[PDB]
């Protein structure tokens, strides 16, 4: 049987809210390592890779490798019935007819139980595992989100140029051009201002802002975000869940 | 000068109207020596809204004649959106009037607002005066009941309320799946705003429309507590204590 | 060359947001005195007069008289990229193809540059000098906003009656009639409820509520608003910018 209990439902609520606009029907692959998700955007441009590690659940039990086909639209509606501080418990039997979601309140003696009907979904192989990147940028997710939404007002595409002197986010449209330059800064001793850049080679790539702004819906999950760049491979946008991660892969248009 | 009613806080009338405006549009305000009452049926004649504002909540209160005041609630909300919650509300009227006067006085600033709302002629006729005998009576936090309705409303348009000797269960099923919230009889002892009381003579299981219940829960601002009265062969009663007196919602079960 | 540096971008953000729904294409007239704007509403009824004095900028440079044709919709998109506490710097040369907007952040230390394409708008105006008003009403901007929005629900027209003892806002529509009377009172203990009236003569005038509610989009600029009334001249609604003003002129309905 499967059982995973989150002290605060807030985590799962926000993770689903970050993916719901890209993927709708996808599998939640469960084993002793935790709950993982790998699904491609409906337009086959972006890939979403999520991992919820077993050490983030208390307790966590998974007797069998199991695939749970779940509509994310169905799940978000149910998860909006849970408050952020509610005790969330996900349960399942040795058969995938339905998934059980239990919402316990720490204060009020109120118990909420939901049974979501499962679906039959087949997963992809899927590429790609572990690419070595030419540039790695760790910056505040809140800052990265504002940069994306701001430039999205001027154009539908953004140019990311990463050199040894910093990272430049370029943009141009009918209205005009837009530019955001962040400098590599370390040991501010105030971690909300830190930007680290590991660079093996300069990179200049163009991406869709429509996807990046969707990626930035995971800003509530982590204060930090990691951008991994190289041509011939998709952009990697990773968010730290603490005990796990949420990764976004996005193919370049350049 | 026939009718005069003064409310300490305009918030009360603001919240009552805001809870009903989406159900009833045209209705009568029945006024006599006892106070101001409203009894109106949903536009689809499924739900009944019953309000009673007793005269002891007004200072002063004057009503020379039993009178019915036909008032459009849309018009009334626009006027009531001009009143702050802590304004002194004064409702005035002449003998058998064309319009009703609403005066909003500010306790702080030297600001006075006066409005004259044109009346309409609406007939109700009958009417009971029910005195229903219920099999189960549930007193629970209104904030909790509102969340239960709105949460289950996401999965389906229909809800099953089961009240037994061991508690009350709100059950639901839809295309997505099933949902259930069970509340236990609880007493505090610690925080009495979380208390749940159940008076039960016999178990009851009825099905109701969540679309109406969610609308009923717009009265959550009126009381921290809500009372659910259930019995077979009769509609659900959802009552809110206004503090002399009450706001009631009646909803027929779905066969 | 033109250079103007605002300590807080919030001011320009709010000013544009106050005018954007009346005027969209207009010139920003710049000289050594400062940056001024004078444009008429699209329906050719209301006149908007803005002045940003040079003493409000640090630093401020303008070598030659220049007009900057700017779409407010485009500018709003760009100014929504600036945080309220960002250092805003407006730069342009004499021969203007475009205007450069620089957003420096005091916190995240992020620099944003935008190049907004200018438009060709021809300059012209009407004289408006030391007009003598019969009644001057200083009241809370928030209350004036509340009064207009409330009465606008009942009617399209408002009657403003100003005496030495206070101001009455009258209204009548299909639903019924509405009236708000405020008394001239001052009480430093609460400067947000104070109403002062400078009156040489009683005034009773009728105005369009649709324009007044738009004027009240400048409420974010000042806690106070000034109403200047007279039967022989249009209504003046002024908001103090601190270093200058934003003026709305509205003709009475005879």
Which domain CATH number covers A178? 3.70.10.10
| Residue in B133, B181, B127 with CA at minimum distance from that of residue B154 | B181
Strand order in the sheet with B204-209: A60-62, A2-6, A87-92, A98-104, A110-117, B177-183, B167-173, B158-164, B204-209
Is C194 within 8 Å of C186 (Cβ atoms)?
Answer: yes
How many residues would you count in chain A?
A: 254
Rg over alpha carbons for chain B, rounded to the nearest Å, is 19
Cβ-defined contact of A81 to B184 (cutoff 8 Å):
no
Alpha carbons within 13 angstroms on the beta-carbon side of residue C238 total 15
Chains with ≥3 CB–CB distances under 8 Å to C: A, B
Q: Is C234 helix (H, G, I), strand (E, B) or coil?
A: coil
**Domain housing C145:** 1-254
Per the structure, the count of domains in chain C is: 1
**A35 CB-near residues (< 8 Å, 6+ apart):** A4, A28, A29, A50, A51, A52
Going by DSSP bridges, is the β-strand pair B35-41/B225-230 parallel, antiparallel, or unpaired?
Answer: unpaired
**Euclidean distance between CA atoms C69 and C123, whole angstroms:** 9
**B129 CB-near residues (< 8 Å, 6+ apart):** none
**C152 CB-near residues (< 8 Å, 6+ apart):** C209, C210, C212, C213
C76 inside 8 A of chain A by CB: no
Enclosing H/E stretch for A185? none
Q: Supply the angle between the helices C72-79 and C10-19 in degrees, to the nearest 10.
A: 150
Elucidated via: X-ray
Is C90 within 8 Å of C75 (Cβ atoms)?
Answer: no
Is C139 within 8 Å of C219 (Cβ atoms)?
Answer: no
Cβ-defined contact of A114 to B155 (cutoff 8 Å):
yes
| Residue in B57, B51, B80, B68 with CA at minimum distance from that of residue B2 | B68
Q: Is C131 helix (H, G, I), strand (E, B) or coil?
A: coil
Cβ-defined contact of C175 to B108 (cutoff 8 Å):
no
What's the reported resolution, in angstroms, to a tenth?
Answer: 2.6
Q: Supply the angle between the helices A10-19 and A72-79 in degrees, to the nearest 10.
A: 150
Cβ-defined contact of A115 to B194 (cutoff 8 Å):
no
**Euclidean distance between CA atoms C174 and B117, whole angstroms:** 9
Contact list, A108 vs chain B (CB under 8 Å) = 141, 144, 186, 194
Measured CA to CA in angstroms, residue A90 lies from A28, A244, B45 at distances of 12, 17, 42
C109 inside 8 A of chain A by CB: yes
**Euclidean distance between CA atoms A22 and A40, whole angstroms:** 8
Measured CA to CA in angstroms, residue B234 lies from B90, B112, B130, B209 at distances of 38, 46, 11, 15
Neighbours of C135 (CB within 10 A): 23
**Euclidean distance between CA atoms B151 and B181, whole angstroms:** 10
**Euclidean distance between CA atoms C87 and A183, whole angstroms:** 17
Cβ-defined contact of A111 to B179 (cutoff 8 Å):
no
Chains with ≥3 CB–CB distances under 8 Å to A: B, C
Residue of A nearest to B183 (CA): A110
């Amino acid at each position: 049987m499967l059982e995973a209990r989150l002290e605060q439902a807030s985590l799962l609520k926000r993770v689903v809210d970050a993916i719901k606009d890209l993927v709708q029907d996808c599998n939640f692959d469960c084993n002793d390592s935790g709950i993982a998700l790998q699904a491609m955007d409906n337009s086959h441009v972006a890939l979403v890779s999520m991992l919820l590690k077993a050490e983030g659940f208390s307790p966590y039990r998974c007797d069998r490798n199991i695939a749970l086909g779940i509509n994310l639209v169905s799940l978000t509606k149910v998860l909006r019935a849970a408050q952020n501080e509610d005790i969330l418990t996900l349960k399942a039997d040795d058969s995938p007819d339905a998934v059980n979601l239990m919402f316990e309140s720490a204060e009020t003696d109120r118990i909420s139980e939901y049974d979501i009907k499962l679906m039959d979904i087949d997963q992809e192989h899927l590429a790609i595992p572990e690419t070595e990147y030419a540039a790695t940028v760790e910056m505040p997710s809140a800052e990265f989100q504002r940069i994306c939404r701001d430039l999205n007002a001027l154009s539908e595409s953004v140019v990311i140029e990463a050199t040894k002197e910093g990272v430049k986010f370029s943009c141009q449209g009918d209205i005009g051009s837009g530019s955001v330059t962040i400098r590599q800064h370390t040991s501010v001793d105030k971690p909300e201002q830190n930007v680290s850049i590991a660079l093996s080679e300069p990179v200049a790539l163009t991406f869709s802002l429509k996807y990046l702004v969707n990626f930035c819906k995971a800003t509530s999950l982590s204060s930090k975000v990691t951008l991994c760049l190289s041509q011939e491979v998709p952009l990697l946008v990773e968010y730290g869940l603490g005990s796990g991660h949420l990764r976004f892969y996005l193919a370049p248009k350049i």
